[PDB]
Amino acid sequence: SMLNGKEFRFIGSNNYYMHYKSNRMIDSVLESARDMGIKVLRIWGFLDGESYCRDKNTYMHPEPGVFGVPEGISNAQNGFERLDYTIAKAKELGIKLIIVLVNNWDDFGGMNQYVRWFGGTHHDDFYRDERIKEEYKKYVSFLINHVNVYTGVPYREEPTIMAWELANELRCETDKSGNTLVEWVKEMSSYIKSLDPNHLVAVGDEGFFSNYEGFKPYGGEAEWAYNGWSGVDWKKLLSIETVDFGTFHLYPSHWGVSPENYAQWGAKWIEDHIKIAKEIGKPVVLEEYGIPKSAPVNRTAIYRLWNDLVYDLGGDGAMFWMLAGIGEGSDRDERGYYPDYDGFRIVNDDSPEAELIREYAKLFNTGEDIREDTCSFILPKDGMEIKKTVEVRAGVFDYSNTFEKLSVKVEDLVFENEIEHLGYGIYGFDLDTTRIPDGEHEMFLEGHFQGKTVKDSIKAKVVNE
Ligand SMILES: [Cl-]
Ligand code: NA
Prior knowledge:
The PDB classes it as hydrolase. The entry lists the keywords Mannanase, hyperthermophile, hydrolase. It forms a monomeric assembly. The entry is titled "X-ray structure of the endo-beta-1,4-mannanase from Thermotoga petrophila". This protein has 465 residues and is α/β, with parallel strands linked by helices. Helix content is 28%, strand content 23%. It has an eight-stranded parallel sheet. It has a five-stranded mixed sheet with strand order 12-19-18-14-15, with no helix packed on it. The longest helix has 19 residues, at 262-280. The protein folds into two domains: 1-367, no CATH class; 368-465, no CATH class. The chain is built from ten helices and 19 strands. Residues 104, 123, 171, 173 line the site of chloride ion.
């Protein structure tokens, strides 16, 4: 007995405003997901604290024991009604939802809002004070037992909900043994299963490791993500019997990785998580990943690599942060979309990232594997001004298993002998740009495969003077 008892694979995304925006905005996100082949959307199922609820004119958990709009307030939205609408519309369109129950971070209140309600002084009191645990349990029970006003079906019985997730990006830096979070996750996941035996439960953490033999970061960067600093012991969490699948997130630019290493670091992070998920024997989902648009790299090429690895290595899902749709009011940009406030937004438009997502959705959804051999510059980014020595990075995407060698041409120079494989199909070398005159130049990438050449080119402006 299960509402989603078939291990399926998917491309997914995230959207955090599905519980407080208008029907038109919600419809736009879900229709965009359907049109793009995105089968699962990860959404927030929380709005904690009176100030956060006021800010969005939408009430879910403004005070302890208050689940909805408080007394005394007119013209307010109810976040459960907005979630009910989202679920009903997702159901109509065939989209499944992962509903996250609290935020590690302060956005929409988060753990610290609970700490403030109960007179605590530290974020990590959220995991330890029984009164806070009890209030989280009361909130989760209210949500699981809620009857959707549009469908008439309680959330406990709703197959459109794919999974409950305990906490977005939970961390417990005050206990680097990992034990505080193991105990909390065991307690809360067991509690959810006691109320709802029908749905998958997952943690929602970023996937940090805690000094596992043989697992170190690519390039020695972001050691904190591998050494237990955040209080997350991913392998111990995945071993909890009431946790059905593992989650991990990926943001090399937030975590101290250098741009020349974003692609490989993320690739190794993905492979390491799939390897450890296999060691435990449970499925895994890359449930958030992103590169900011302003980063000095080819984002689409990096996303292509990361999605290739999730698919080829047997991961169950890859979900980008984040999908948006049409905007309204102050949350509307010049093109009519919800704005790209963080540099990660993807919409159903004519971007290369959107086209990549559409392609990969078919691959995950039906195994439609028509990937074609490709090579792309990763650094520099097209149109960049460059000077002194540049660490050129290129990806080779070899689906036919016929790749032989890579070359790069700039003016009369042919780089091939010094191009080094850096792992995962990423190649690199140092280009001393003082060898070429200042000005605009085309850089040509040639992937030599058996029986064909595949190409990429970018323009760069050399500005040594
Ligand atoms: Cl934290
Ligand atoms: Na989101």
